[PDB]
C-alpha cells in the first residue's frame, strides 16, 4: 500500500483505489496502473521534474529504503496478477530490487522529489509507475 500526497491530490495504484478515491476521482489510467483523487488537506510531497535514472524506493516487505538504478519509462509486458490480465503497461520503469505484491504504493524518489510508485515486480525485479510527466499534479 501507499500514496503520493501532492497539493490537493492523492496518487495511488489504480488497483488499490478505495471507494472514497472513486467517489472523488480526478483522473485514472488502467494502462499505467494509476488513479488520482482529490483531498481536503494539502500534502507535503513534491514531484520530481527531471531525467534521473537513479533513486531510492521504499520496500514495505523489508521495512527498508533501497538505492536503485531504473530504466526509462516504457511499454513493458506484465504477467497476469489478481488485478489485471497479462498485458502491456505503459510509463513503467524496471529495476533490480526486492518486491512482493503488497509493496505496491511505495515511493521511488530522487534529489528532485517523487518519481513514481511501486506497481509490479517478482524474482528480484521491481517496477515503478512514473508520474514525472503529469505536470498538472503541480497546480489547481
Ligand atoms: C509488487 O509486485 C509484485 C512483486 C512480486 C511479485 C509479484 C508482484 C505483482 C505484480 O507484478 N503486479 C503487476 C500488476 C500490474 N501493475 O499490472 C499489479 C496488479 C501486481
Ligand atoms: Zn531527479
One-character DSSP codes across 14-53: GGG--HHHHHTEEEEEGGGTEEEEEEEEEEE--B--S---
Question: What is the number of the ligand closest to the CA of 121?
Answer: 1
52 and 38 housed in the same domain = no
Reading the block at residue 13, the C-alpha cell is 495504484
The torsion region of residue 102 among left (phi > 0), alpha (psi -120 to 50) and beta comes to alpha
73 and 110 housed in the same domain = yes
* Start-end of H helices in the chain: 19-23
Structurally, the chain folds into a number of domains equal to 2
Does the Cβ of 33 fall within 6 Å of ligand 1?
A: yes
Cross-strand bridge partners of residue 64? 59
39 and 54 housed in the same domain = no
- Tell me how far CA of residue 92 lies from CA of 3, 42, 107, in angstroms: 17, 27, 14
| Cα–Cα distance, 48 to 35 (Å, whole number) | 18
Active centre residues (catalytic) = 15, 33, 104
Does the Cβ of 68 fall within 6 Å of ligand 1?
A: no
Method: X-ray
Cross-strand bridge partners of residue 66? 57
Reading the block at residue 118, the C-alpha cell is 511501486
CB environment 96-125: b (16+ within 10 A), e (fewer):
ebebeeebbbbbbbbeebbbbbbbbbeeee
- Quick one: which of 127, 100, 99 has its CA closest to 32? 127
Q: Look up the domain containing 18 and give its range.
A: 3-44
Does the Cβ of 101 fall within 6 Å of ligand 1?
A: yes
| Cα–Cα distance, 68 to 96 (Å, whole number) | 7
Asked if 79 contacts 86 with a C-beta cutoff of 8 angstroms, the reply is yes
Asked if 119 contacts 83 with a C-beta cutoff of 8 angstroms, the reply is no
Amino acid at each position: 500500500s501507499g500514496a503520493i500526497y501532492v497539493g490537493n491530490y492523492r496518487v495511488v495504484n489504480r488497483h488499490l483505489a478505495t471507494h472514497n478515491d472513486w467517489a472523488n476521482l480526478v483522473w485514472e489510467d488502467s494502462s499505467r496502473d494509476l488513479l488520482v483523487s482529490s483531498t481536503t488537506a494539502q500534502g507535503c510531497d513534491t514531484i520530481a521534474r527531471c531525467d534521473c535514472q537513479t533513486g531510492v524506493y521504499y520496500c514495505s516487505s523489508r521495512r527498508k529504503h533501497y538505492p536503485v538504478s531504473f530504466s526509462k519509462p516504457s511499454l513493458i509486458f506484465v504477467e497476469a496478477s489478481e488485478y489485471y490480465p497479462a498485458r502491456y503497461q505503459s510509463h513503467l520503469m524496471l529495476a533490480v530490487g526486492h518486491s512482493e505484491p503488497g509493496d505496491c504504493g511505495g515511493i521511488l524518489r530522487c534529489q528532485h522529489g517523487v518519481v513514481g510508485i511501486v506497481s509490479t515486480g517478482g524474482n528480484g525485479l521491481v517496477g515503478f509507475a512514473d508520474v514525472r510527466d503529469l505536470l498538472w499534479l503541480d497546480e489547481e
